[PDB]
Amino acid sequence: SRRWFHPNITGVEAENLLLTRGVDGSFLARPSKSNPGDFTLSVRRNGAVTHIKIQNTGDYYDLYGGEKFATLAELVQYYMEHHGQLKEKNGDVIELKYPLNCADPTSERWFHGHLSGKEAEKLLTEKGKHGSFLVRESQSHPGDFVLSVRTGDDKGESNDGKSKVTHVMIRCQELKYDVGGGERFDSLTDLVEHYKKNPMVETLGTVLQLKQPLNTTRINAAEIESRVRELSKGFWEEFETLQQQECKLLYSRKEGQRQENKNKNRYKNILPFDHTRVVLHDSDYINANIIMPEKKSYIATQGCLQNTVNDFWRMVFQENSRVIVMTTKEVERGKSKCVKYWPDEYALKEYGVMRVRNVKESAAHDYTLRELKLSKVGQGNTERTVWQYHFRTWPDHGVPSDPGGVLDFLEEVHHKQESIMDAGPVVVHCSAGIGRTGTFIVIDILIDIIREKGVDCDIDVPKTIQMVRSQRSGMVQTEAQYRFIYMAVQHYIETLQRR
Template sequence: MSGEHNVDRTFQDFDCVVNGGGSMSLQPSNFYYPISGVEAERLLNTYGSEGSFLARPSGSSPSNYTLSVHKGDRIKHVKIQNNGDCLDLYGGETFASLSELVQFYVENPGQLRERDGEIIVLKCPLVIPPTEAIGWAFSRPSTERWFHAGLSGPEAERLLLTEGKHGTYLVRESHSSPGQFAISVKAADDKVIHVMIYNKNDKFDIGGGATFSAISELLEHYKRNPMVDQAGTVVNLKQLLPSTRLPATGIDTRYYRLEQVNRTTGKDGFADEFEKLQHQEPTQFVSRREGKKISNVCKNRYKNIIPYDHTRIVLNVSDADSSDYINANHIEILGDEYQEFAGLRRNYISTQGCLPNTIDDFWNMVWQQNSRIIVMTTKEVERGRIKCCRYWPLKNETEKFGKNGELVIKSVEEVENTDYTMRLLQFMNTNHDNETRLIWHFQFLGWPDHGCPTDPRTVLYFLEKVNECEEHNCDENAGPIIVHCSAGIGRTGTFIVIDILLNQIKRLGPHCQIDIPRTVQMIREQRSGMVQTEQQYRFVYQAVSYYMAIINRRLDSEVSYM
């Protein structure tokens, strides 16, 4: 079966609702629209489902807000009182911002009730397509490189003081005034100045002076003509501190922005982002002592690809003469440090392609970690070079591995597809009372000898098959998915990053925020060099873009059906 067949069908299991899988960070740009109650009802009835919601200005009191919620058979409007210091639903909990209020009632579904006691459930913000004027207007800023979604004023100050030079600036949404924006710029004497951008009648200004039809035009104007604040301080906009965070629905627009070449540096946005990632790589300060030991050097396929000690797989050894070393690292979701992934459960082992002298170690690792799925992203030989020794038996054959042949691998089934081969292996350990496990071995064959695949759908289809196998054939006690190429960092890192991002979108829905550089950075903290080349980095964007196109086609067909 070709990897191109039924590709749309394989991506239909995402859910807009967060059902116990973790929470999403809600910002005004996710859910606030300056529209009337009548328009809110039209949009919710057209594009929403039960639990979809949006916030809007109150029709009767402009300083207050209204929460409009799809109740299945009707639209419910909930008044939000703004007393100037805090927000509340006319009694009960009080909140400092609209985001905090909405976040609370999303995460505590039993707390929001109608007067008769019936619960009002907030599941996810309404996703308004760009074919609607309001959807287009509000999606544009979130895909711009200058826009930092979800960034508060204090967070902007810390970011600019840490990374910015004098004149470095960014744009964020105002948390105190939903629908409005602010420029945060690092001025002289390490001072950060915040300038409000006002949006009136689809025109933008900074509280006086010229008006502009787009924030981009406003920024370009004040880059040429410095602003002066009320204290007489000259505020220069010199260099942008670009954002890497964006809504998944805006991936195509961001891709276009990243393709633009900077006239000064001659580099496009992909090169800028990847170069910054390279500078953040902490290789000099993280121990890799074990892989550099004389006794272990022969187990490294490449002398410069060494696992970090703090995440390396430590093999269980039965005698002092055996080494516990294998060139492999645990890769997991670091939810405490990268809170956008809190609640996402994905575990991998990233390792190199087997050498003749590491095959026994590899199978010992598979058994020890209770891994049931192996993902191989390379052919055994490419361009005349051995990339990985065959470590599995040929079709319908059995091979023994381990110090005393205690690891018995039998080929049960082998299914060849256009772009990948799936092997079902039976793994018996005679040292464990002949305990037998099933191992699914997926070998991707569609990666070209040079560069990256021209069409990401083959990779997406392959990963979906891996995920289906994990869901249907692996219980909750199954260990990490083992992923390898030749060095265990390039294609391996690319596959892992794409898999993490797609699972995040499936979990939170197409409206969720994603950050590709931070995702790469997270796995690089656990194994150096993951996503090895700029071309692989660009391919991650292409894969997510294609995946979102599939989702958008599905949403469009559902709206047409309705």
Template sequence: MLKNSDTVSNKGENAPLPVPSPSSTSVADVAPTLALAATSPTLKAPIGVIVTAKDSSVSVEDVKEKVKSSNVPAGLPAAERGTAAREEYGYIVTNQSPLSLYDGVKLLELLAERIHLTTSSFINISVVGPALTFRIRQNPQNMSAEDVAEKAGEKEPVCLSVCLSLSLSLFSPLALSDGSSGLVLTLVSMACVGGVVVVALTIACLRHHTQQPASGKLGLGPEGGPETHFDYQELCRQHMAAKTSLSRQEAVGVGAGGRRGTDTSRVSSVSSQFSDGPQHSPSSHSSTPSWSEEPAQSKMDISTGHMILAYMEDHLKDKDRLMKEWNALCSYQAEPSAVTVGQSESQLEKNRCPESLPYDHSRVKLKAESNSTKEDYINASIIIDHDPRLPAYIATQGPLAHTIADFWQMVWENGCTVIVMMTALVEDGETQCVRYWPDEGSSLYHIYEVNLVSEHIWCKDFLVRSFYLKNVQTQETRTLTQFHLLSWPANGIPTSTRPLLDFRRKVNRCYRGRSCPIIVHCSDGTGRTGTYILIDMVINRMAKGAKEIDIAATLEHIRDQRPSLVHTKDQFEFALTAVAEEVNAILKALPQ
């Protein structure tokens, strides 16, 4: 009901109750409240309901008298004046022009809530310009439009939340003339057009919204957005600035088998955008890359670094001590150590080497319902550092021709964004790993479409490929990066640790602390794979500020999760040397 401070404007007593135009009053100078009252049903002109300014002083009774003195509301066509009422219509004039059908319905919902009617009681709802018109249908409460006004007038004024606060009135049109029929048709037509526009805008907004996540996912995996892709581009810019002194032809010679003339990798089809042009090449036997990078920032303090470095140097100098430690590692037995799934007859053909099988308790399990053979087995193991909820690596064998789809399924289901490949495709005439990516363009492996976006030669020791991965069932897309090391022979170790350390820094720069595991594989997924994981895990622990580093204990830890990681004593010694050199580089970078 109207409060003493809520008033209507002072008009003459016999003047008809006006319907304010949308431009007559602004939202800023109108109190956002509704005041309602009622009259007798015998009157030709029913009640007016109006939102008013707070600076006048007319009571509810004055409003009723104004309505009684008026035969019809102002603004009705002359042809409709002076005839007996048959149907009661309501109309709302708002300060929104044009008024959207959505906002009009929201206003009716507010009114229905106040008088305890359902919104279905309002019929013949139309919107034209700033106005909304409606009728009250037969309802369980047997309320007419007049009753609606009377009941609403018994409630306290309410605040409107959608800025629809200029005027609310009721009128009683007579038998429809030809002109009024045209008006109704116009209102209905405009309502239909408005509805179509609203639906079209809604569809457009939804399509735009659904395209946003898809484009965001092109930044390497479900977690990363575009950041990793930008990291990759940054690496490219660094390499361009460094001007590697290796020509594309020499890289092709080293690419496939670690020696010249054995070309089985797609180095010759590198995107022209990454070409540095012909340059003078160093010796193909050089183990030093043409560019390098400083170690990442580390939380390791100087005293801890010197202690770790001294420990590593003692091990490396004392060959007997190193041999005893290696022998102790060889006698270590992991528990549990069952490999029954990998040994089963149905899975034997999925293993490259029958001696290199995953433990049952730590093997990667595929979703059988999504697998081409409806099985969950792949020769791959989950490797945890310290948090079982966040696996750090997946150690796996190089895919076979009939397990490529399984490999990409594993990549997809684990949300991996980085693949570390530690082997050439062919070494000494023996296949180490099949090409599980397209030579160019795209290839479909079961339900996973793999598109080779770019292939970039960083130096003679490794190259980088960027892939666009799509699940054709869900239409979801991701990107990921493969780092391919070429300078580690199958039955030996690199002549220098520096290429591997540079390689590892590039991998970690791209990975950048994501929570998904890094996939690491060589041929059988044990020797070179285990050595890389051991080196990376130890250096990462040091970078996080660990005070004690025990490489032998760390090796036992990862061997608890996959057998035979780090095959030989030479590989173990190489890991010690790599860690020592990285610690030395970190110490040099620390402020003295």
């Protein structure tokens, strides 16, 4: 459960960890600082350490000499149940047996490190609820930590005195942690997890429940500039924090794994969650999920394959979708990303029982809009206009340097959607339909709150990403995409405060 990920280690330091603390079959992953965006799977075998590269340009995790994955936890899980899959150049098998646990508490939601005692109380007071807790570094006693918990009736401020904020010392004694007596734990993580199962009870019977970490990522949109600045010189900690939670999301993907369905997947192991998969009743399978903010919903799907085009048009029809957002060139960096599934301008085409006319193509600066008429065969009355926004200026690597273009694009897609009273979910896709797709959908969801509720509302980026990730694997792929989301929301804010 992601303890095998070491967010701060170096290629050399990991070598040591696997050679000293580790045995054959021990493994860990770390962000390589070779290429920011790259990752390394360091596995100890036959006495030594082999490094296995994993590349993520923003579409998926590409395990060099392995397969592609939506998340690292899915990558790891996959291999710890398909022995003999991970192979080296000369066919040798690489076993992943023992997760080499990291002790760095930085990525935990509950850890805050840099934080005074007055702050902690202020936060627990304002944001806190019964069960809200945090672990900060001690200033009164360096090297040691402090657990602050809240217990009581209701949340937010109060004077009823019904709620309170207890603090507990956590000492670091010779590289282990304790609360004053009892067990000594090898890491803060271990200590905290133990005191969630077995909560400390006070003398007079107050049970110190560690229910939920305290939320420090929710900001007021009005103030997002100051928060981004504060994160510029944070983003990484906040992001790797968000990334640690991906282990909670290893939901089933059985339908996608079935035999009859394997070749409907662009990448064999990037699959739709069963509980949110689009089901076609028009087989029933397509590599797509409904993403629902929790009014406007989305279908996030992979770029069509030749043999899935008919299914894609069945889905659009069935879902009553009237807008499609395509965020990829058909071909990029040599490889196919999406097959052309629309007719040439003016042409009419049949894809199975579905019929599409490309009525008109308009070219704007960053995208192309194609007005499409979709109908079922035999029943010429089911004619409905489907508007396809094909975004064209997204770089082969990384993200746009300025969110302006994406923002204007989205505003347009939003107005289109809004002008059609029937419209079902907005279909959004790229290559695997998780990276750019997730980025576009998160920005869209965020902006929509701001457009509705205004500049004086609360937004929470990692919380929104996490909510999206629980509906399709790996939504939003990289830290670059993570920052771009903040910049797009920022840019949106000041153009609202200027118009």
